[PDB]
Amino acid sequence: PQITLWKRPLVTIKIGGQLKEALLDTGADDTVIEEMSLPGRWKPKMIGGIGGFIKVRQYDQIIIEICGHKAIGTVLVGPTPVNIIGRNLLTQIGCTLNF
Amino acid sequence: PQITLWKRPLVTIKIGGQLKEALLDTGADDTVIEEMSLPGRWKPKMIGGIGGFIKVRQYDQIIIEICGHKAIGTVLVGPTPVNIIGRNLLTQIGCTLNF
Numbered sequence: 001p002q003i004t005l006w007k008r009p010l011v012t013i014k015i016g017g018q019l020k021e022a023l024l025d026t027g028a029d030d031t032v033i034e035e036m037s038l039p040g041r042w043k044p045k046m047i048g049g050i051g052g053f054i055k056v057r058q059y060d061q062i063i064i065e066i067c068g069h070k071a072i073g074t075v076l077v078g079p080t081p082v083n084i085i086g087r088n089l090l091t092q093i094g095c096t097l098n099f
Numbered sequence: 100p101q102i103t104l105w106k107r108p109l110v111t112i113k114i115g116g117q118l119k120e121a122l123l124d125t126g127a128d129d130t131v132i133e134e135m136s137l138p139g140r141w142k143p144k145m146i147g148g149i150g151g152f153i154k155v156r157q158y159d160q161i162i163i164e165i166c167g168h169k170a171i172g173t174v175l176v177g178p179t180p181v182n183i184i185g186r187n188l189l190t191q192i193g194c195t196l197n198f
């Protein structure tokens with residue numbers, strides 16, 4: 001698909017058995033999702049940007065489905081204002097910027 | 100061009116006659132640049148990032164070149180992690196996400 005940037009590029013994703021709306025973010029190195037239950041062990045971590053930092057929990061080898069494409073990678077869970085799909089997963093679905 | 104996301108999508112921009120490195124950020128609604136001198140009057144603007152909301156200075160109709168592509172638009176100036184090229188300018192230069 002070709003997504004324009006007139007509005008926020010929000011897509012529907014499936015993670016941990018639930019559906020969520022998330023933002024395709026080329027500025028995010030990783031993927032951070034609002035509080036939810038995920039399998040496996042996790043490690044504390046801090047991520048920061050505009051406005052400062054927030055603490056999140058890092059879960060690895062998490063499967064996610066975005067627009068029909070299944071990808072696997074690290075997923076951070078914490079008090080993010082918006083669910084964000086970062087580069088670590090964008091690469092997996094063959095997402096690129098074009099102009 | 101077509102930019103992959105295995106590494107941060109960093110580009111060289113030109114603003115105020117000076118070259119600077121910036122991030123093509125589809126998760127940012129606006130373009131935020133590190134402290135510098137822009138002409139004209141500015142107005143207040145609050146933007147919400149990963150860590151919360153912050154106050155920045157909004158300058159309109161600012162000449163800026165992105166990887167050789169000339170543009171003229173709104174540039175926000177404030178405490179940012181990196182120079183962020185947001186959707187307002189990404190759209191102007193005809194940038195889209197593809198997969």
Ligand SMILES: Cc1ccccc1CNC(=O)[C@H]1N(C(=O)[C@@H](O)[C@H](Cc2ccccc2)NC(=O)c2cccc(O)c2C)CSC1(C)C
Nearest residue numbers: 027028030047048049050081082126127128129146148149
């Ligand atoms: C988001 C994330 C996920 C995983 C690991 C680290 C991080 C932290 N990275 C970051 O925060 C990076 N940012 C990003 O990835 C941005 O796309 C960011 C995403 C976002 C959207 C809505 C709520 C909260 C965050 N957007 C904004 O900061 C943003 C949002 C709205 C208007 C605006 O003018 C801006 C600059 C811009 S600064 C940054 C290049 C460091």
